[PDB]
Structure 1
Amino acid sequence: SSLPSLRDVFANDFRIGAAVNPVTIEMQKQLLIDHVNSITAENHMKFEHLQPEEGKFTFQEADRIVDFACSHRMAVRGHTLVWHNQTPDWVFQDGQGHFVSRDVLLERMKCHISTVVRRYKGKIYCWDVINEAVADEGNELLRPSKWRQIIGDDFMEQAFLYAYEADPDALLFYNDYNECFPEKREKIFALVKSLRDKGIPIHGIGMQAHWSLTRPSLDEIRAAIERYASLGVVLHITGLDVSMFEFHDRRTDLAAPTSEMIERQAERYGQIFALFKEYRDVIQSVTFWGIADDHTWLDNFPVHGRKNWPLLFDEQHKPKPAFWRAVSV
């Protein structure tokens, strides 16, 4: 009540978002209403939750998310159309269980993108069209995937063009994680630059920002922002969280964060939002992958069955020390 509202604090800088589903919308309703002006579906706008079988569209959960957002004047980011994960097997198969033609996968991709994007036209202002296509390791530019396998390397071009035709007023994003590690950063840059150079309607890069207390460094975040902004795209931070564990830290028996963890996280969040505010001219939206520590996918990834404390509010929805540093930049 005397607490500052995130969206108001950053009114002149960027929207503040949260990834939700119908359960967490209920469980965290007041936090969302008090703090965010933007909503993303954590799972219920992915392919498997929209077209689980060919011709069977299940919009019910996505609809509730959108209805919530509209009834509280929140923008909506659509997530996500084309991705190597959470896409049912039928998409790539024929009756015989073999892989489909390039042309058949294109028709399925187009049908899906047109049905989904047209339904929410005028309520969803941007879409993560392509998710995580760039390789996370090695020196190949692109990760392997059945989309890429079957269609070829121009599947991303096609997807953006399909999405643009379905709603040409939407901002279309390439979305990815580890976006600030230099070698991956240069792949993302090179990929997006190539698409823009062919006139493909890609308007933005989504920086997932699934970050740790240490990685990436502030200098790596700054360099990535400037590298991407130089392409003329808009930047969204799309899944911000700050894990208490580094990647190598697979501990399962921490029942609570240490006070050192909590303190360093507050500092880390303060520094990060200072950096975001500095680049307010190119960052238009900052979405957390959740909103309070009672729900986070980091509880079970990358270690199943533990607990993480990655967000600005604790499990009782009370502001953490990271909250105070974040709003005071």
Structure 2
Amino acid sequence: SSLPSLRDVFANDFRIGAAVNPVTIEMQKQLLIDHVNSITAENHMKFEHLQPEEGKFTFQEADRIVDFACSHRMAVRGHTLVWHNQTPDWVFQDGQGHFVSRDVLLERMKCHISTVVRRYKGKIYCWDVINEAVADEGNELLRPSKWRQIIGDDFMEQAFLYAYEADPDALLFYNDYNECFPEKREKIFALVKSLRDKGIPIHGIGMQAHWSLTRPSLDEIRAAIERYASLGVVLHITGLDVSMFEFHDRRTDLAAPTSEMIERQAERYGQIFALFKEYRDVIQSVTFWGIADDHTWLDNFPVHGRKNWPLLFDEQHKPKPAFWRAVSV
């Protein structure tokens, strides 16, 4: 009751969001009502959860998420239309198991985007149209995917044009992770610059911020913000969490975070939100990929079956030390 509300603390800076599903909306309902003014579907607006078979649309769970958000004056970010994961095999196949043509995959992509975006038009204000198309390793610009293989390299500009036609008032985003490592930052910058230089309706870059205690550095975060902001696009932080484990640290035995971990995490969140506040003119939304440590995808990624403690509230929904530093910047 005397705890500050995240969305009020940052009222003049950016919206505060959380990724949810209908279970976690129930299990974490009071945290959400007390703190966020933005909602993202953690899984139930991905292609496999909206059109699991061709012409079979399953909007029920996404509807419950949107209904919750509208009944509490929360905005909604749509996630996500075209992605190399969580997309059923039928999308790329014909009746005979072969791959479909460029023209056929384009009409399936258009129909999906059209049906999904039209249903939520006027309730969902922005869409992650393309998710994680840039390569995470190597020297090529683009990751391989059936979207890219079948259609060609312009599959992304098609996706953006189809979504703009379906809802020209939505802000359309390119969304990606490890967005602050310099070599991937430059690929993301080059890709988005080239699309905008063609007049493609891409309005925003989504910085997932699946970060650790050490990586990326505050200087890499600042440089990435300024690099993306220089394109004239809107910036959203879309999946923020702060893992207690570096990428090399695949330990399964840890039953509670050390007090060093907890303290470094608090400091890390303080520095991150100070940096965000400083760039309040280009960042308009900060969404955590969860809200409290009783639900996080990091419990099973990248290591199945361990436990992580990445968010501002603990498993009993009490503020962590990180909370106090985050709201005091």
Q: Which residue of 2 aligns with 1:284?
A: 284
Residue 267 of structure 1: how far off its partner (Å): 0.1
Distance in 2 (CA, whole Å) between partners of 1:123 and 1:258 is 42
Residue 82 of structure 1: how far off its partner (Å): 0.1
- CA deviation vs aligned residue, 1:96-115 (integer Å, no higher than 9, x gap): 01000000000000000000
Distance in 2 (CA, whole Å) between partners of 1:34 and 1:187 is 38
Distance in 2 (CA, whole Å) between partners of 1:117 and 1:65 is 15
Residue 320 of structure 1: how far off its partner (Å): 0.1
Residue 12 of structure 1: how far off its partner (Å): 0.1
Q: Which residue of 2 aligns with 1:103?
A: 103
Distance in 2 (CA, whole Å) between partners of 1:172 and 1:97 is 33
- CA deviation vs aligned residue, 1:297-320 (integer Å, no higher than 9, x gap): 000000000000000000000000
3-state DSSP of counterpart to 2:78? strand
Residue 171 of structure 1: how far off its partner (Å): 0.1
Gaps of 5+ in 2: none
Q: Which residue of 2 aligns with 1:91?
A: 91
3-state DSSP of counterpart to 2:172? strand
- CA deviation vs aligned residue, 1:62-84 (integer Å, no higher than 9, x gap): 00000000000000000000000
Residue 59 of structure 1: how far off its partner (Å): 0.1
3-state DSSP of counterpart to 2:142? coil
Residue 241 of structure 1: how far off its partner (Å): 0.1
- CA deviation vs aligned residue, 1:155-205 (integer Å, no higher than 9, x gap): 000000000000000000000000000000000000000000000000000
Distance in 1 (CA, whole Å) between partners of 2:253 and 2:117 is 43
Residue 6 of structure 1: how far off its partner (Å): 0.0
Residue 210 of structure 1: how far off its partner (Å): 0.1
Distance in 2 (CA, whole Å) between partners of 1:161 and 1:327 is 39
Residue 327 of structure 1: how far off its partner (Å): 0.1
Distance in 2 (CA, whole Å) between partners of 1:64 and 1:234 is 28
3-state DSSP of counterpart to 1:168? coil
Distance in 1 (CA, whole Å) between partners of 2:123 and 2:315 is 31
3-state DSSP of counterpart to 2:239? strand
**TM-score (ref. length: structure 1):** 1.00
Distance in 2 (CA, whole Å) between partners of 1:130 and 1:52 is 19
Residue 154 of structure 1: how far off its partner (Å): 0.1
Q: Which residue of 2 aligns with 1:77?
A: 77
* Superposition CA RMSD, Å: 0.1
Distance in 2 (CA, whole Å) between partners of 1:327 and 1:31 is 15
Residue 231 of structure 1: how far off its partner (Å): 0.1
Q: Which residue of 1 aligns with 2:34?
A: 34
Percent identity of paired positions between Structure 1 and Structure 2 = 100
Gaps of 5+ in 1: none
Distance in 1 (CA, whole Å) between partners of 2:170 and 2:6 is 25
Residue 266 of structure 1: how far off its partner (Å): 0.1
3-state DSSP of counterpart to 2:187? helix
Residue 215 of structure 1: how far off its partner (Å): 0.1
Distance in 1 (CA, whole Å) between partners of 2:108 and 2:248 is 39
Residue 118 of structure 1: how far off its partner (Å): 0.2
Residue 261 of structure 1: how far off its partner (Å): 0.1
Distance in 1 (CA, whole Å) between partners of 2:236 and 2:242 is 17
Residue 29 of structure 1: how far off its partner (Å): 0.1
Residue 218 of structure 1: how far off its partner (Å): 0.1
3-state DSSP of counterpart to 1:250? coil
Residue 23 of structure 1: how far off its partner (Å): 0.0
3-state DSSP of counterpart to 2:80? strand
Q: Which residue of 1 aligns with 2:150?
A: 150
Distance in 2 (CA, whole Å) between partners of 1:78 and 1:133 is 17
Residue 295 of structure 1: how far off its partner (Å): 0.1
3-state DSSP of counterpart to 1:39? strand
**TM-score (ref. length: structure 2):** 1.00
Distance in 2 (CA, whole Å) between partners of 1:178 and 1:213 is 14
Residue 122 of structure 1: how far off its partner (Å): 0.2
The count of corresponding residues between Structure 1 and Structure 2 is 329
3-state DSSP of counterpart to 1:90? helix
Q: Which residue of 1 aligns with 2:193?
A: 193
Runs (4+) off by over 3 Å: none
